[PDB]
Design a protein around this ligand. Structure first.
Ligand SMILES: CC(C)C[C@@H]1NC(=O)c2c1c1c3ccccc3n(CCCCN)c1c1[nH]c3ccccc3c21
Length: 267
């Protein structure tokens, strides 16, 4: 047979390495000498397809403005994956970078809104991400944010700190378990890249969380946004808000929730 996304190898041209990985690397290049693309290569032979194209198989059935776009694939060795190019790289690196110092609440909340918007689409498609966090979020020009990295992210039929209890203990990955991760993601944005649960390892946090402990309101962060985190951190996953609620709440934040927001030294 043949693949509808399959393009010839001579259609692209790798130029600049964007960052090596433990399963390959990412390259900026030109598709047909006109299309600016981002090629995800392969480093043999750890993976070594399981299939490695499963990253793309899901990116075929999904399409949204807040999701990183799939362009094409290459089935023969060396295996390649062509897709949308995000100039600023990972959100985590971006927050930890120089720009993180100048980011304030308006920009941070707006970025979360886009992610919530992207995840709202995923919610409508009846899909789960299973690894929603700042490291898996690509940022481009004009502070645009797009959901990325779809490993084993499938239908409905170890980042423990970002993972919901029922998903870590019983493997019950739902769209409501992604909401949990979104609440953790909101702490990463309000701390500008700090690892959640500071001074706390995987075993002690899982026990502490199961007992009912939740992360405190981060410095300069308003109570209204912290409450949203707690809603996402409710023990019973059915009570967690939808991404439809999350997107709408964030988009209308500085008008309907905090109309009297005054900038601080960090937020
Ligand atoms: C559409 C796809 C093939 C390429 C995507 N486009 C980029 O510009 C880009 C991309 C990825 C990506 C995709 C899938 C899995 C991991 C990926 N990574 C590693 C980051 C850790 C993810 N949790 C990427 C990355 N890293 C950067 C650094 C600087 C500039 C651009 C990218 C950059």
């Amino acid at each position: 047979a043949k693949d509808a996304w399959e393009i010839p190898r001579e259609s692209l041209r790798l130029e600049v390495k964007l960052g090596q990985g433990c399963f390959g690397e990412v390259w900026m290049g030109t598709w047909n000498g006109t299309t600016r693309v981002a090629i995800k290569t392969l480093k043999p032979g750890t993976m070594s397809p399981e299939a490695f194209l499963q990253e793309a198989q899901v990116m075929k059935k999904l399409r949204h403005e807040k999701l990183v776009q799939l362009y094409a694939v290459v089935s023969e060795e060396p295996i390649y994956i062509v897709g949308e190019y995000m100039s600023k790289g990972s959100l985590l690196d971006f927050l930890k970078g120089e720009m993180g110092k100048y980011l304030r609440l308006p920009q941070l909340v707006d970025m979360a809104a886009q992610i919530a918007s992207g995840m709202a689409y995923v919610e409508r498609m009846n899909y789960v991400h299973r690894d929603l966090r700042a490291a898996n979020i690509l940022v481009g020009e004009n502070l645009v944010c797009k959901v990325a990295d779809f490993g084993l992210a499938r239908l409905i039929e170890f980042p423990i700190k970002w993972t919901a209890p029922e998903a870590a203990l019983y493997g019950r990955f739902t769209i409501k378990s992604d909401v949990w991760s979104f609440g953790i993601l909101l702490t990463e944005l309000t701390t500008k890249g700090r690892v959640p649960y500071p001074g706390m390892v995987n075993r002690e946090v899982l026990d502490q969380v199961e007992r009912g402990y939740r992360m405190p309101c981060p410095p300069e962060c308003p109570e209204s946004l912290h409450d949203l985190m707690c809603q996402c951190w409710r023990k019973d996953p059915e009570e967690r808000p939808t991404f439809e609620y999350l997107q709408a709440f964030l988009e209308d934040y500085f008008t309907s929730t905090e109309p009297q927001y005054q900038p601080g030294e960090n937020l």
